[PDB]
Write a protein that binds this ligand. Structure first.
Ligand code: AMP
Ligand code: AMP
Ligand code: AMP
Ligand code: AMP
Ligand code: NA
Ligand code: NA
Ligand code: NA
Ligand code: NA
Ligand code: ZN
Ligand code: ZN
Lengths: 429, 429
């Protein structure tokens, strides 16, 4: 009553790592527990494809790429991931009349460039990609069910609106679970599931007349169709928490008439530039492509590894923030050059392989580093401290390789572990 | 009257529910680390006087696979030691026949052993311990056993392990793994810790006179020095279970005066050829180098993956056993070829990405395969059935790639998972 409740999944029969994640449904770090076995069903909101993507977009998709690699490569969860493409939107329609190429052709062009930018940043494609334009029929059926459950109504003009008041009345439903204080139509807060088509706009048939999906209904529809009635993880940037994500929860609860569609809602922090969110509207943005003419994938990923994913970060342009990233990337490149040369030039015939006190001290540091990094990853994917641990280990390996007689097997094993963590970070050396 | 075994406590340990065939219990028992997720592992190494053969490959490749499963798949932290017996009666005899120094012979065949391991994609251990570099430590180890009253000195300057005295202690049992395999000596079963050397043999100083280590003492000494008083895993071929490994247990228990030096003792089965152990003494052997002039590393590793590590296996020469290995290797090569090209040439601009029933069916089989393979690895490293599970999945992916419009992201994830399992098997495509 008056405050939304959250049900932690039961631990019996689940993979239990003791990972804690910052859950927006609880506004707290809570233990992450799969709904089933070691499986993670994960939906992440995708871009609206009418122009080039920028560094703020990169921060969200790279940060969740890192989290996905930690979940899969490091913890060995089984991740089934869906990302949508909003290729029907007011912005796409308006941009297409300006550009005088079909709306489909414009949306497809900027979707293609989005995925090329993701590939350039070594971001893994999701399991499924759901374009609104390929799901309109399913969206209509989804809305039909919400109406049948009495949680939406049809206006005279042919639009369909979600009935917030009817939804709240139900004891099993709470509206705006994540931002309770942020809250033709019955009430102003009602939001469109189906918009009657304006003249000259692209449109689709429905029982209520020609129209387009509303802003939020595609994500509930697509995630529900592929992933079902319980998502382990839903993600997006913090600006989407309300109204978009809270409205997705209400739509999906209305469709299934249950109380918890998402177990863990994860929200990345914004990249700021000169104190403000990097934003197309503010014209303060740097495109991913322009960033990539000056900096590499590794350097950009290090920029993001240095900042906790769920906190905001400041980007100082003109290379100021990238100085440290370039230095770190260079130290990793040089570390690999040196250790590979030491391994290559090692001669078993002329060496002595006695396990010395220096060998033992490096090994002790090595195993300790593994446990420190494990605790950092369990602590809500703390990559800044994990990256620091790798840097400290590399500093000691460099000292060891310069003076001590080297244990070839130990150096190889350390290199393989650092390779393993770098694969988890998405770095390529 | 029968040896007891203490299962490690589960509190605070990484618990995977892995079961392993433990020679100390003659049964499959749950594997539990002594500390956290750490595995201290000693494996007996070669005697370096001649070339390694396919039977040696079977043992070192099988335990390489187990190590990759433990590390890459389950994420245990393995600290592994392998010794090199570069002082031995066989080395001395061979070196006089060929008229070269004992060290020059041993370094040559140690070098060829590691080259053969690398050719088979076998990972080097953390530490490599040569007897010739540990003689001083062996002397100190023997001094302690004498001080604990479990060894005696003969008039000629040899030191023998005192089986009768060791057994008398209520905390010690002699021959824990093969209880039934049991003039100057007190009892015939007593075995040398230090052998008085003939003036023409290589020898080292000691409190008891010039001599050489006995046959078993080097392994207790080296493992105890580097890994300590409790090993999680000790491994070797089944012929070493007695007397060599049972004697290591007695020596190490006598040194530490405790009851369990090794928690899990793993013994690989022998590779036979025409019904008999592949053996230098029988002159029925195939060198690893000769095998690699006929078959690839992948094909040889598939041969071993097809046979449970702890069971004996028959090798039929003249290509008979390798027919199936070549076919499997060919099917993996052709699968990777197609999936890599389909991923590389996929065009996001022109495709349709609707998640169809065929996509869903392949995804269901994919996740199911992950669970089957997990159960096989937990079942005492059952690679034959995991390999079969991969083959079955590949057959369905090949059908999907031929007919259905392809989900690029699903194919990428399948490719990455199969790569992950092939990394765990040590296959390279
Ligand atoms: N790497 C993995 N692959 C597939 N299933 C897993 C994995 N790790 C844990 N599980 C599942 O997690 C549940 C409990 O994990 P555990 O108690 O660690 O065996 C079982 O249903 C297992 O099948
Ligand atoms: N400046 C930014 N920093 C971090 N994430 C952002 C930024 N701008 C947009 N995003 C996220 O990028 C994703 C796509 O943004 P949009 O295309 O605006 O829907 C959403 O999850 C947004 O929250
Ligand atoms: N991947 C890993 N890396 C380092 N330590 C681990 C790992 N998995 C489990 N552990 C350790 O195992 C003990 C208990 O495991 P758990 O209960 O799974 O956290 C703790 O001391 C953990 O640090
Ligand atoms: N035919 C064989 N099959 C499997 N393992 C063997 C075979 N011959 C020797 N080994 C193992 O290879 C390792 C080194 O053997 P050796 O070089 O004979 O001391 C030991 O663990 C032996 O048990
Ligand atoms: Na309510
Ligand atoms: Na908002
Ligand atoms: Na006894
Ligand atoms: Na034996
Ligand atoms: Zn969305
Ligand atoms: Zn040994």
């Amino acid at each position: 009553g008056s405050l939304p409740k959250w049900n932690q999944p039961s631990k019996e029969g689940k993979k239990i790592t003791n990972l804690f994640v910052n859950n927006s449904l609880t506004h707290s770090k809570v233990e992450f527990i799969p709904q089933e076995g070691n499986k993670i069903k994960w939906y992440a909101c995708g871009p609206t494809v009418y122009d080039a993507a920028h560094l703020g977009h990169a921060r969200t998709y790279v940060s969740f790429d890192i989290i996905r690699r930690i979940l899969v490569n490091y913890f060995k969860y089984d991740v089934f991931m869906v990302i949508n493409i909003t290729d029907i939107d007011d912005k796409i329609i308006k941009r297409s009349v300006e550009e005088k190429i079909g709306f489909t052709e414009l949306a497809r062009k900027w979707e293609y460039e989005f995925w090329e930018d993701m590939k350039s940043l070594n971001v893994l494609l999701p399991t499924a990609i759901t374009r609104v334009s390929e799901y309109v029929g399913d969206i209509v059926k989804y809305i039909e069910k919400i109406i049948e459950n009495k949680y939406a109504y049809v206006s005279e003009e042919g639009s369909v609106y979600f009935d917030i008041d009817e939804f709240k009345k139900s004891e099993k439903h709470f509206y705006a679970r994540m931002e309770p204080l942020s809250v033709k139509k019955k009430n102003a807060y009602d939001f469109a599931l189906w918009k009657s088509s304006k003249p000259n706009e692209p449109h689709w048939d429905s029982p209520w007349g020609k129209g387009r999906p509303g802003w939020h209904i595609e994500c509930s529809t697509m995630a529900s169709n592929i992933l079902g009635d319980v998502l382990d993880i839903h993600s997006g940037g913090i600006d989407l928490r309300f109204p978009h994500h809270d409205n997705e929860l209400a739509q999906s609860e209305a469709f299934f008439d249950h109380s918890q569609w998402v177990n863990y809602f994860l929200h990345s922090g914004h990249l700021h530039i000169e104190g403000l969110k990097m934003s197309k509207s503010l014209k303060n943005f740097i495109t991913i492509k322009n960033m990539l003419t000056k900096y590499t994938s590794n350097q950009i990923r290090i920029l993001f590894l240095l900042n906790k994913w769920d906190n905001f970060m400041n980007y100082s342009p003109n290379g100021e923030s990238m100085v440290q990233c370039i230095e770190i990337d260079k130290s990793f490149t040089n570390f690999f050059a040196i250790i590979l040369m030491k391994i290559k030039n090692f001669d078993l015939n002329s060496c002595n392989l006695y396990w010395s006190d220096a060998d033992n001290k490096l090994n002790l540091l090595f195993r300790q580093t593994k446990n420190k990094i494990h605790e950092h990853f369990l602590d809500n994917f703390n990559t800044p401290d994990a990256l620091l641990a790798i840097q400290k280990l590399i500093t000691e390996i460099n000292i060891y390789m310069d003076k001590e007689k080297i244990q070839i097997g130990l150096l190889l094993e350390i290199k393989h572990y650092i390779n393993f963590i770098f694969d988890t970070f998405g770095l390529i050396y």
